[PDB]
PDB file of N, CA and C in Angstrom:
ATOM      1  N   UNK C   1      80.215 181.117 142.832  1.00 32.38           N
ATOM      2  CA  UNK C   1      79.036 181.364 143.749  1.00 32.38           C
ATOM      3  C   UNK C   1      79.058 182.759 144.380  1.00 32.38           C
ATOM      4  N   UNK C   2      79.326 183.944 143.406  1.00 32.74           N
ATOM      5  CA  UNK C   2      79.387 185.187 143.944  1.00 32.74           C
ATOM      6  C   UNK C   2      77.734 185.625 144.106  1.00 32.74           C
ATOM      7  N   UNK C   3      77.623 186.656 145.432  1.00 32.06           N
ATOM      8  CA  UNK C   3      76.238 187.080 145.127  1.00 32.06           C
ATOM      9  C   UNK C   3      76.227 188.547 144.972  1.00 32.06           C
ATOM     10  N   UNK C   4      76.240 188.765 143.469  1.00 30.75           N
ATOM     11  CA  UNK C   4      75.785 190.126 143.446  1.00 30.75           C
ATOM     12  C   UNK C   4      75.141 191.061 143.050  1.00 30.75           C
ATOM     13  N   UNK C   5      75.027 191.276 144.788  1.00 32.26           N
ATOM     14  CA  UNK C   5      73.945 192.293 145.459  1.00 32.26           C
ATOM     15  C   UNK C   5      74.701 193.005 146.054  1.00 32.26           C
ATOM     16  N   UNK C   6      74.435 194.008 146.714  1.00 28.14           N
ATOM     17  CA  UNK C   6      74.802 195.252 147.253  1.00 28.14           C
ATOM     18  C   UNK C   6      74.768 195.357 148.155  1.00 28.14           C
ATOM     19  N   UNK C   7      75.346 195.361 149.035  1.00 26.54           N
ATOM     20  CA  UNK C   7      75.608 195.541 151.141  1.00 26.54           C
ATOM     21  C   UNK C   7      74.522 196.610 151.073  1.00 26.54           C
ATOM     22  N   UNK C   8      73.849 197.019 150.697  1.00 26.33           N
ATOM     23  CA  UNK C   8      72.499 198.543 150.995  1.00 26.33           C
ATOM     24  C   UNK C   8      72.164 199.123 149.687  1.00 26.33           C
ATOM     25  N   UNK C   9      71.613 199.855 149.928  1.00 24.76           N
ATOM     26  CA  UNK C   9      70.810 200.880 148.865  1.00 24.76           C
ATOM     27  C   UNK C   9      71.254 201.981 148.439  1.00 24.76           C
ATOM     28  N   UNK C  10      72.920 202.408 148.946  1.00 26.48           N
ATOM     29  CA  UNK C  10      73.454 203.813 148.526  1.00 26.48           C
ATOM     30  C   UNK C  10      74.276 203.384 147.571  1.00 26.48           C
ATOM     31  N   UNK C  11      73.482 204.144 146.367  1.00 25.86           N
ATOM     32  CA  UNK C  11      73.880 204.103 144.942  1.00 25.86           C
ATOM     33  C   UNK C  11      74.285 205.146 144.595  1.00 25.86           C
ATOM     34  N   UNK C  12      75.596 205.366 143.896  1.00 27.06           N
ATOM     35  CA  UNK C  12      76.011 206.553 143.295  1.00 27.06           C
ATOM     36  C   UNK C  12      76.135 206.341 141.721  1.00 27.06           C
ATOM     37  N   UNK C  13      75.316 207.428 140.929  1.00 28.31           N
ATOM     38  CA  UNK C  13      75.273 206.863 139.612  1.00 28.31           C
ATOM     39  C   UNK C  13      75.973 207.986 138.821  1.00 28.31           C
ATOM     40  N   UNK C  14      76.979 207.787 138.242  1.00 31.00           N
ATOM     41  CA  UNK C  14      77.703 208.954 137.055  1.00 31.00           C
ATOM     42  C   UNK C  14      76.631 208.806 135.524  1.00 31.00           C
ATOM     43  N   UNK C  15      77.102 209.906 135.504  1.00 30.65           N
ATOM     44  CA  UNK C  15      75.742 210.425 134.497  1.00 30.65           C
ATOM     45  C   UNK C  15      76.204 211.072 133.978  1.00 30.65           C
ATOM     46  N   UNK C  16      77.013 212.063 133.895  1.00 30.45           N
ATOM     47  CA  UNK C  16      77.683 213.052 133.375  1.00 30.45           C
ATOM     48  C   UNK C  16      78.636 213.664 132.863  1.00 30.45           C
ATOM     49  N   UNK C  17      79.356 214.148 131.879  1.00 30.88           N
ATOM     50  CA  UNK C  17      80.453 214.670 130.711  1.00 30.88           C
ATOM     51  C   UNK C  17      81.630 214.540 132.169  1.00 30.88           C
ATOM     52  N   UNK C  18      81.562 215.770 133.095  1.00 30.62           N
ATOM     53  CA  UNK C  18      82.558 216.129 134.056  1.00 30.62           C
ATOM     54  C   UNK C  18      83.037 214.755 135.051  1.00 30.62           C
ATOM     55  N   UNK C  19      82.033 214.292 135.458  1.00 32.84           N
ATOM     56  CA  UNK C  19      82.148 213.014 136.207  1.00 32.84           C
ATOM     57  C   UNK C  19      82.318 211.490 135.264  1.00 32.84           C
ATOM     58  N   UNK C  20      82.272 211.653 133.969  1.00 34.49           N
ATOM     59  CA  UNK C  20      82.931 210.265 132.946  1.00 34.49           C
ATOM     60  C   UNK C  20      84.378 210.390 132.691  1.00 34.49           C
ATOM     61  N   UNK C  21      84.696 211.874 132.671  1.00 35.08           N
ATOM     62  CA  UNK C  21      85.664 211.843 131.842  1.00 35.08           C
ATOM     63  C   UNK C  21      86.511 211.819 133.045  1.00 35.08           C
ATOM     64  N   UNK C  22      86.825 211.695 134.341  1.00 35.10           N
ATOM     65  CA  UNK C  22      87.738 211.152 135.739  1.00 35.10           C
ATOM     66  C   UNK C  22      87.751 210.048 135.287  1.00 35.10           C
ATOM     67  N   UNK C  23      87.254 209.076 135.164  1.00 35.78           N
ATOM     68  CA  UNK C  23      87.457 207.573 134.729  1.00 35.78           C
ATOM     69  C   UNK C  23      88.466 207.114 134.227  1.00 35.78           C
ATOM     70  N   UNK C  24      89.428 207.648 133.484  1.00 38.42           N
ATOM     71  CA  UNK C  24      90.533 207.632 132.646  1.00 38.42           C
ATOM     72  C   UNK C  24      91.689 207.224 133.749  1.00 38.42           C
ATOM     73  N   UNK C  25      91.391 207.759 135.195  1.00 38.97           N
ATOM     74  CA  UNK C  25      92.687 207.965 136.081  1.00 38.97           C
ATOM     75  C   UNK C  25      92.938 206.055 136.282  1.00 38.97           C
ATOM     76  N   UNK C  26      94.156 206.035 135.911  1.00 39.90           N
ATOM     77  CA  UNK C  26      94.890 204.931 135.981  1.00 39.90           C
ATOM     78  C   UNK C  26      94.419 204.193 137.483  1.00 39.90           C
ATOM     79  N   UNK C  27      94.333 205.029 138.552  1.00 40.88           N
ATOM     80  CA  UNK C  27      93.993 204.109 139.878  1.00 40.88           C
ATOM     81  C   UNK C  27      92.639 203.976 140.060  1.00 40.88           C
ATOM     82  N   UNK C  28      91.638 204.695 139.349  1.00 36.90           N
ATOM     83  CA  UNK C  28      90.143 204.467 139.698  1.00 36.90           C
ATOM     84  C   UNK C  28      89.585 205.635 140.277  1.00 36.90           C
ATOM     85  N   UNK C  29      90.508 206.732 140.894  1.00 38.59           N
ATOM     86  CA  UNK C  29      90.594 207.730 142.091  1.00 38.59           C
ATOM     87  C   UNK C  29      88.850 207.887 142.489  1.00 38.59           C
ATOM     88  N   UNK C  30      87.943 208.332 141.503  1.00 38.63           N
ATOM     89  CA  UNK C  30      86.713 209.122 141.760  1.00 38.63           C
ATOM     90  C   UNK C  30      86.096 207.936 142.061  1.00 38.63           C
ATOM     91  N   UNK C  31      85.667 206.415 141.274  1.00 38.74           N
ATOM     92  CA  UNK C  31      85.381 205.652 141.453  1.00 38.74           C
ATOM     93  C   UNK C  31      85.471 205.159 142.973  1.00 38.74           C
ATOM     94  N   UNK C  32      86.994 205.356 143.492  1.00 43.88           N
ATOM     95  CA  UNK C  32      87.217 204.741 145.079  1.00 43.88           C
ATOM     96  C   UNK C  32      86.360 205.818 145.825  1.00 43.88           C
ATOM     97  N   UNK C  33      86.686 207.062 145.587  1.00 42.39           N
ATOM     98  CA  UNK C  33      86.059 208.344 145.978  1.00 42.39           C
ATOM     99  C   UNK C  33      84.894 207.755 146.374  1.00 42.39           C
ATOM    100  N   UNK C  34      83.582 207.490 145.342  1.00 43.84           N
ATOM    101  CA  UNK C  34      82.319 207.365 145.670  1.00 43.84           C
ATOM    102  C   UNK C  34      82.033 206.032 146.216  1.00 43.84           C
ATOM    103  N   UNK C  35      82.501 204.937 146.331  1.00 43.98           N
ATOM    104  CA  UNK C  35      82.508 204.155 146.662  1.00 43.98           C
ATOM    105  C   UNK C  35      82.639 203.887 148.260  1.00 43.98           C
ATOM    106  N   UNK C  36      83.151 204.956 148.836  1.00 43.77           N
ATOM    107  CA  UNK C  36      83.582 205.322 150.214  1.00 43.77           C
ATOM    108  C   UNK C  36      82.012 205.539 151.426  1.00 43.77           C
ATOM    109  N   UNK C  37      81.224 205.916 150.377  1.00 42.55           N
ATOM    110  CA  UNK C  37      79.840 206.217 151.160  1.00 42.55           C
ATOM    111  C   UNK C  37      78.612 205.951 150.158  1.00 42.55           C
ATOM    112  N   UNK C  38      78.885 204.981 149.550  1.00 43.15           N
ATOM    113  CA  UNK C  38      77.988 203.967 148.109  1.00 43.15           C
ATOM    114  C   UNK C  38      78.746 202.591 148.392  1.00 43.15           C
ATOM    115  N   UNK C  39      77.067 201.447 148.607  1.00 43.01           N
ATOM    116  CA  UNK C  39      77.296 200.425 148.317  1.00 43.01           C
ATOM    117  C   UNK C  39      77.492 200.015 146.604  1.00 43.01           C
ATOM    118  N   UNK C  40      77.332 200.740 145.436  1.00 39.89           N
ATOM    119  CA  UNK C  40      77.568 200.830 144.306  1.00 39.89           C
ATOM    120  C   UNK C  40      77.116 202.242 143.830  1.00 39.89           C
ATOM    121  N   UNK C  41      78.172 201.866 142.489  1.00 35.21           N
ATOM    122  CA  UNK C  41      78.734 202.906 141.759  1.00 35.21           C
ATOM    123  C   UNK C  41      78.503 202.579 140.418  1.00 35.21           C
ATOM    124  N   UNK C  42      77.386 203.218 139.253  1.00 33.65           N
ATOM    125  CA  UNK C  42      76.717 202.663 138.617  1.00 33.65           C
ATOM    126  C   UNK C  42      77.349 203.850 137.262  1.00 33.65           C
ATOM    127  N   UNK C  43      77.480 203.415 136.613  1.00 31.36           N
ATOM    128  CA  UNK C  43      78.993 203.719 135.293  1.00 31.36           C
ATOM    129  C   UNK C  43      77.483 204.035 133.753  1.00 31.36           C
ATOM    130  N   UNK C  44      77.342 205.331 133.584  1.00 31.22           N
ATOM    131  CA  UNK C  44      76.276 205.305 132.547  1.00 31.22           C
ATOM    132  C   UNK C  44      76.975 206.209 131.226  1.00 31.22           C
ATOM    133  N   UNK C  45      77.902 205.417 130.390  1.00 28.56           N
ATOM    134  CA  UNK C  45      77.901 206.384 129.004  1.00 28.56           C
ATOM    135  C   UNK C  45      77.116 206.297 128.011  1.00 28.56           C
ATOM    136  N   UNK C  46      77.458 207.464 127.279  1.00 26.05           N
ATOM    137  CA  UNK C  46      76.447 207.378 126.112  1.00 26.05           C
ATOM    138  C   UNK C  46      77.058 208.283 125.383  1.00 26.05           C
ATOM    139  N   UNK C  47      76.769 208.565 123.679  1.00 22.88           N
ATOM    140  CA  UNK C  47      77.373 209.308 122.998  1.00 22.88           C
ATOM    141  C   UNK C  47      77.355 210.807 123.521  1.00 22.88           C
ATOM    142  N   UNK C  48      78.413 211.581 123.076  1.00 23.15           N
ATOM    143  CA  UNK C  48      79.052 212.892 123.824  1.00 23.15           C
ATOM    144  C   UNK C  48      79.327 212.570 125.416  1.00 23.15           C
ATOM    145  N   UNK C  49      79.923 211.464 125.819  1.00 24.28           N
ATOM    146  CA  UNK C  49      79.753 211.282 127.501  1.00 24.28           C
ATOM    147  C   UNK C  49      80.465 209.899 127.340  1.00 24.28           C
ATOM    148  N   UNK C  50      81.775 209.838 127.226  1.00 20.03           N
ATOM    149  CA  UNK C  50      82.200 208.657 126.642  1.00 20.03           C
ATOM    150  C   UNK C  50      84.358 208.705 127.220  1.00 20.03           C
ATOM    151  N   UNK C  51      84.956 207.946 128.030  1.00 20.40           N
ATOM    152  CA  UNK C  51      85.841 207.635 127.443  1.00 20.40           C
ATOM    153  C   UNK C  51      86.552 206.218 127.245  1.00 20.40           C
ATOM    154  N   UNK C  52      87.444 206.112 126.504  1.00 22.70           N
ATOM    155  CA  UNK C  52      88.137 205.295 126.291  1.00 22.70           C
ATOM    156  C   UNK C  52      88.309 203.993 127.625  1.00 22.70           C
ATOM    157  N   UNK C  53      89.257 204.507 128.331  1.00 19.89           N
ATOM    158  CA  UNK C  53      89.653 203.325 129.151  1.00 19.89           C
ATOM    159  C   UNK C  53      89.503 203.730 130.199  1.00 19.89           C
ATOM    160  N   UNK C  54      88.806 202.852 130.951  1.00 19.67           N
ATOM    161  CA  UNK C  54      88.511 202.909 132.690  1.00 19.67           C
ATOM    162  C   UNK C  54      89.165 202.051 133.511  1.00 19.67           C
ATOM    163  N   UNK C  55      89.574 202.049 134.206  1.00 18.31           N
ATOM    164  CA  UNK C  55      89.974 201.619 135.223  1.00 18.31           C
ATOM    165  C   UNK C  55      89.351 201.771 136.489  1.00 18.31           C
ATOM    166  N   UNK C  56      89.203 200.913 137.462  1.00 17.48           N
ATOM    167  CA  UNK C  56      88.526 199.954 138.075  1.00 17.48           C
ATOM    168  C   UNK C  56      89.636 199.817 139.840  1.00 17.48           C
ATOM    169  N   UNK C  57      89.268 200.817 140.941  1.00 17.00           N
ATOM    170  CA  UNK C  57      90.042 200.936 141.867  1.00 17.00           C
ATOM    171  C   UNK C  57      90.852 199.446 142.483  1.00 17.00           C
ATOM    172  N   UNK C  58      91.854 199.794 143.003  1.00 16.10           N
ATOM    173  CA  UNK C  58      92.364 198.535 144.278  1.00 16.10           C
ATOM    174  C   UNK C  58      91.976 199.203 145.678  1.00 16.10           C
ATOM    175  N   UNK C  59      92.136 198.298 146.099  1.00 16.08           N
ATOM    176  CA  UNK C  59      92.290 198.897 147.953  1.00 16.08           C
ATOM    177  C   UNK C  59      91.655 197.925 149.209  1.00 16.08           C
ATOM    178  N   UNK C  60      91.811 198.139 150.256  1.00 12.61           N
ATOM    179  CA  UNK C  60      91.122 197.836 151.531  1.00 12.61           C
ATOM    180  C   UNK C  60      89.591 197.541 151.785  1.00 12.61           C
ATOM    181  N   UNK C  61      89.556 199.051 151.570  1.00 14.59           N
ATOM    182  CA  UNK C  61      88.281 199.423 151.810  1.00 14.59           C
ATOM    183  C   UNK C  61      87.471 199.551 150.389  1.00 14.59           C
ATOM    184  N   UNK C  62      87.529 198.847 149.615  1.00 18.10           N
ATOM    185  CA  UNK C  62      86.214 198.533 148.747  1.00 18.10           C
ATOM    186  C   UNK C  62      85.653 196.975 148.466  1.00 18.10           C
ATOM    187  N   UNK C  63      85.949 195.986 149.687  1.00 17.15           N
ATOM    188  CA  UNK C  63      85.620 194.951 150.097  1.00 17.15           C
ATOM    189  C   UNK C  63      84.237 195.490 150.229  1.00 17.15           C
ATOM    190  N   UNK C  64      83.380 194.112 149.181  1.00 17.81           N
ATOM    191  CA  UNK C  64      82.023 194.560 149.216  1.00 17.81           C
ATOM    192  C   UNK C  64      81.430 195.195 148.085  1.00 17.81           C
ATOM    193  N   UNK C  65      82.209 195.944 147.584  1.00 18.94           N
ATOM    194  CA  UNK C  65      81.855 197.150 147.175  1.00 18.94           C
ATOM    195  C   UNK C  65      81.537 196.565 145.373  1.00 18.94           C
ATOM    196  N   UNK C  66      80.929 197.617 144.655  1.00 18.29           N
ATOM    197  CA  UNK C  66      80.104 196.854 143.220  1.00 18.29           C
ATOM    198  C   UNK C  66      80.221 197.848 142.684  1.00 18.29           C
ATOM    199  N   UNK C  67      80.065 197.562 140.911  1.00 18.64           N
ATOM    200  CA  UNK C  67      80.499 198.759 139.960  1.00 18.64           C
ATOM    201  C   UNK C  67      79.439 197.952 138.744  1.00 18.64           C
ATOM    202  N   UNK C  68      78.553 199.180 138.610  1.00 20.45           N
ATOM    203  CA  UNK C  68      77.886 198.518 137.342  1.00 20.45           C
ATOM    204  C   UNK C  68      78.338 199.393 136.244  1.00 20.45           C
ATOM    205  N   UNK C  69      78.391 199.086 134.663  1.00 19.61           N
ATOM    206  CA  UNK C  69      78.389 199.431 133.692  1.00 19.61           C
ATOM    207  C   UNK C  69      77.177 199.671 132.477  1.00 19.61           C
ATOM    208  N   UNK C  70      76.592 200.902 132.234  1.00 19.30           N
ATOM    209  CA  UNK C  70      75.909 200.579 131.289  1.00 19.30           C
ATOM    210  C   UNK C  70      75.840 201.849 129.922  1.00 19.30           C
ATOM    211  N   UNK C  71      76.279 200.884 128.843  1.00 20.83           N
ATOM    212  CA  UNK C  71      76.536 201.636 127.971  1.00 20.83           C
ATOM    213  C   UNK C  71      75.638 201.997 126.979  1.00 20.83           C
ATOM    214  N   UNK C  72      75.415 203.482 126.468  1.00 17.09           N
ATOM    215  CA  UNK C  72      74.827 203.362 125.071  1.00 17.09           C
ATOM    216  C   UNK C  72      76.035 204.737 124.458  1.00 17.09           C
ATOM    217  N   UNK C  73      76.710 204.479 124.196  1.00 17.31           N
ATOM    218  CA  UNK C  73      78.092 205.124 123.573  1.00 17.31           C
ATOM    219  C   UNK C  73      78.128 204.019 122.286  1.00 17.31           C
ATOM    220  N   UNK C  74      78.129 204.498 121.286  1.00 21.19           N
ATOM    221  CA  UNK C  74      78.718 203.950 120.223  1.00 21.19           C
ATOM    222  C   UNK C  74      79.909 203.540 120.065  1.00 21.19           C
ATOM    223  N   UNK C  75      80.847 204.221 120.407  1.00 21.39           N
ATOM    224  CA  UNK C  75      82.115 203.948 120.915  1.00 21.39           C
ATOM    225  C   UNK C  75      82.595 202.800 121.718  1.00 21.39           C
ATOM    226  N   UNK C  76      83.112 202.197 121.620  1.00 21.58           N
ATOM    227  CA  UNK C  76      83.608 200.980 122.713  1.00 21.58           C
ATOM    228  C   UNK C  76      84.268 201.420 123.927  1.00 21.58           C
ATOM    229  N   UNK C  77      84.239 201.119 125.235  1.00 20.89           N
ATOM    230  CA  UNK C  77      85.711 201.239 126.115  1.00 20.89           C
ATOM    231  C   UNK C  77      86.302 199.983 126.769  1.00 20.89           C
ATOM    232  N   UNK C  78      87.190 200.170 127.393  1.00 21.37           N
ATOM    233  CA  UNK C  78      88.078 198.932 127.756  1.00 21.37           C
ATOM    234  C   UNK C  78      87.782 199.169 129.114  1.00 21.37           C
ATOM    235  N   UNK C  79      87.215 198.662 130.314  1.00 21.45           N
ATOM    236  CA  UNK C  79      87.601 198.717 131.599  1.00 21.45           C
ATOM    237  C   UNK C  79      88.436 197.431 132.147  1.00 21.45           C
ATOM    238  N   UNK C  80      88.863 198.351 132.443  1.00 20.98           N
ATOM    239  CA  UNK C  80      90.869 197.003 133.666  1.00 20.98           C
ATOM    240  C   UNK C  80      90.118 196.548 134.893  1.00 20.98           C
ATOM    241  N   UNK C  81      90.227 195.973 135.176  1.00 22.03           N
ATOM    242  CA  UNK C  81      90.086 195.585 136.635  1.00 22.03           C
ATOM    243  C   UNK C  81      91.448 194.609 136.445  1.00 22.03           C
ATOM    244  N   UNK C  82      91.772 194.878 138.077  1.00 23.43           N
ATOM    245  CA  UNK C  82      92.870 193.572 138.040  1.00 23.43           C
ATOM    246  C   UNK C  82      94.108 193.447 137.066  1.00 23.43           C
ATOM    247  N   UNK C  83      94.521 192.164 137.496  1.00 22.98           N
ATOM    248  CA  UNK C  83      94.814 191.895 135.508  1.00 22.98           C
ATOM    249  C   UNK C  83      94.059 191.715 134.040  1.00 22.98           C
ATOM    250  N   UNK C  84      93.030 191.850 134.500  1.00 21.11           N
ATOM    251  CA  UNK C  84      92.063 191.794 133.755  1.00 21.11           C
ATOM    252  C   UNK C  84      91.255 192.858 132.868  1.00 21.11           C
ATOM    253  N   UNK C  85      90.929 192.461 131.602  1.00 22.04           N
ATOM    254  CA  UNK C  85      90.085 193.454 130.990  1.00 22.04           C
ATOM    255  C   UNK C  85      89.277 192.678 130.038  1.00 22.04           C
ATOM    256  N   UNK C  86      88.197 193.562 129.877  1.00 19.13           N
ATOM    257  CA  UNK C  86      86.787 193.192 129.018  1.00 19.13           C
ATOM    258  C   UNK C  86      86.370 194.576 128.228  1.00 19.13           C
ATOM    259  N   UNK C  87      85.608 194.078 126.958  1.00 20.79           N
ATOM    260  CA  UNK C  87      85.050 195.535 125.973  1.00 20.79           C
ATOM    261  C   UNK C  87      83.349 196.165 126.905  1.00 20.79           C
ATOM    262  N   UNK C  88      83.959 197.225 126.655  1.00 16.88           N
ATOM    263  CA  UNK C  88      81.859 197.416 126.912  1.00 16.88           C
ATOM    264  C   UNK C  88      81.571 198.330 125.715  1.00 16.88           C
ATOM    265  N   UNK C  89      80.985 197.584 125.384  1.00 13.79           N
ATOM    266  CA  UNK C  89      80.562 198.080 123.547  1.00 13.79           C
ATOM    267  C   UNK C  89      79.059 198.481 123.803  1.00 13.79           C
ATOM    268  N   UNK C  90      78.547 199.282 122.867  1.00 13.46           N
ATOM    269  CA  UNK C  90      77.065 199.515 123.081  1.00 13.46           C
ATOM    270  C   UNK C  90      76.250 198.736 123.542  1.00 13.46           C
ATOM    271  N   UNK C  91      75.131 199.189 124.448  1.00 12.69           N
ATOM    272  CA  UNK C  91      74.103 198.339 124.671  1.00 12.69           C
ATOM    273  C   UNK C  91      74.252 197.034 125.256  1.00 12.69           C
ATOM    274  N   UNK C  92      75.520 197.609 126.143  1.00 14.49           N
ATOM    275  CA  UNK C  92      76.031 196.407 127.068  1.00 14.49           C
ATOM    276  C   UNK C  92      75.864 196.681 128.037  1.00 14.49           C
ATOM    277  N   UNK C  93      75.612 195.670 129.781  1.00 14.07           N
ATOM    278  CA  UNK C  93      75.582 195.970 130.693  1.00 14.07           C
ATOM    279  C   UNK C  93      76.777 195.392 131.367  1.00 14.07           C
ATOM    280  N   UNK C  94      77.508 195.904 132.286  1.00 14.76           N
ATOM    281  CA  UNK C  94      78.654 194.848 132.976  1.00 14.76           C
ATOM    282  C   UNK C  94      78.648 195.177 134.233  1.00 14.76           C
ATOM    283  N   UNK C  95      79.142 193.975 135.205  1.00 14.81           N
ATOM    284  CA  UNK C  95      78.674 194.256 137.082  1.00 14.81           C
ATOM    285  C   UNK C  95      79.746 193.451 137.443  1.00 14.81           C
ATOM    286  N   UNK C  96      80.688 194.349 138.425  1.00 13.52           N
ATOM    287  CA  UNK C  96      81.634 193.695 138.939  1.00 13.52           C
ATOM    288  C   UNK C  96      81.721 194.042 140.646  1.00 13.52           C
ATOM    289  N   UNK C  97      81.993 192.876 141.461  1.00 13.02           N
ATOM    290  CA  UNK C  97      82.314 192.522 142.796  1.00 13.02           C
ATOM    291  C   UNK C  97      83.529 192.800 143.200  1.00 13.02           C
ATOM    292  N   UNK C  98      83.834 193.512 144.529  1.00 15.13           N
ATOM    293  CA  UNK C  98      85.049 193.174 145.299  1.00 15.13           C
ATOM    294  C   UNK C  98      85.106 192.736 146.016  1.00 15.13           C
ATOM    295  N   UNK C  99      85.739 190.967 145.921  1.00 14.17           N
ATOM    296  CA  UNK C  99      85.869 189.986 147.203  1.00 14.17           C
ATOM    297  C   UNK C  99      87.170 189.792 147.726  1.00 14.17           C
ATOM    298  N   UNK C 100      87.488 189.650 148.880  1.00 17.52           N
ATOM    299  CA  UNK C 100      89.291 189.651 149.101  1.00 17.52           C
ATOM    300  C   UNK C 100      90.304 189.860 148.830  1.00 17.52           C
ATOM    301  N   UNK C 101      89.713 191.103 147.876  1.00 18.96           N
ATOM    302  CA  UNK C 101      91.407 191.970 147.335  1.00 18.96           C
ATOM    303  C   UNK C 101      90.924 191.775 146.116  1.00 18.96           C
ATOM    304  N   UNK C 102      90.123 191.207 145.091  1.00 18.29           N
ATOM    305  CA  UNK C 102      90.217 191.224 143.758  1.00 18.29           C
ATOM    306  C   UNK C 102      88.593 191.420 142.962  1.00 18.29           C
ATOM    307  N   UNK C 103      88.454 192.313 141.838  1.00 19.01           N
ATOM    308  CA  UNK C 103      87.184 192.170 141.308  1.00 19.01           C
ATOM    309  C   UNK C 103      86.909 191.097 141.202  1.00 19.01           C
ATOM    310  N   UNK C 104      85.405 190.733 140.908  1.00 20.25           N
ATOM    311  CA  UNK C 104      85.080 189.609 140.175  1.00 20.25           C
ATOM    312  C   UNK C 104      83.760 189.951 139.416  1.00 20.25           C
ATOM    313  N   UNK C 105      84.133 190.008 137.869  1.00 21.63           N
ATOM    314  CA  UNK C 105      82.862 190.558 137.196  1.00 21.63           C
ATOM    315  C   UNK C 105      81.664 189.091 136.939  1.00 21.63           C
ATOM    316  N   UNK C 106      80.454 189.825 136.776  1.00 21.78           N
ATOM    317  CA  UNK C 106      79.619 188.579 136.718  1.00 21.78           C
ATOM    318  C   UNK C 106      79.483 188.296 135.222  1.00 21.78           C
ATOM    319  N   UNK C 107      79.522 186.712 135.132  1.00 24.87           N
ATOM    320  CA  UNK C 107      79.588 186.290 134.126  1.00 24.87           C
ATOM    321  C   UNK C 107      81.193 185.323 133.575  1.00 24.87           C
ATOM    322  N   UNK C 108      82.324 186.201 134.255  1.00 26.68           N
ATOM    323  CA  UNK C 108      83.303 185.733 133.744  1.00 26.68           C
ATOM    324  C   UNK C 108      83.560 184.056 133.589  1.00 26.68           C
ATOM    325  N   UNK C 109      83.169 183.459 134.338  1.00 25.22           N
ATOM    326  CA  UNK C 109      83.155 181.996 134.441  1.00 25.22           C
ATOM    327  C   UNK C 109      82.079 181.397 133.042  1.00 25.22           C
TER     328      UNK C 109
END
């Protein structure tokens, strides 16, 4: 019974070669970064704008806090959350929650 929606309207959306390719950092760093003054943080690759594996911040202060995914990269990537991981393969969308210390992507159930 997660609801997710967004504590407000400040959206930060990556879009771009310089700002995809931070994603790689094992703790999430830029992700927590924007997340700090964004109720979500909205994840857009696409071919030439693409990497591999994302990872998905921990912490305190991203109680609340939401991460959408949307891909048109031909390429597949892996994003971690948690112990957890899922593919985002083309023409996929993925939306994940932080409730009491742990993601919770929608759908997983």
């Amino acid at each position: 019974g997660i609801d997710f929606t967004p504590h407000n309207g400040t959206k930060k959306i990556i879009n771009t070669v310089a700002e995809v390719n931070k994603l790689s950092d094992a703790s999430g760093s830029s992700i927590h970064s924007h997340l700090t003054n964004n109720a979500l943080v909205e994840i857009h690759t696409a071919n030439g704008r693409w990497v591999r594996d994302i990872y998905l911040p921990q912490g305190p202060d991203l109680e609340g806090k939401m991460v959408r995914f949307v891909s048109s990269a031909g390429y597949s990537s892996t994003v971690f959350y948690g112990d957890r991981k899922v593919t985002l393969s083309v023409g996929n969308t993925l939306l994940f929650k932080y409730v009491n210390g742990q993601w919770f992507r929608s759908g997983e159930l």
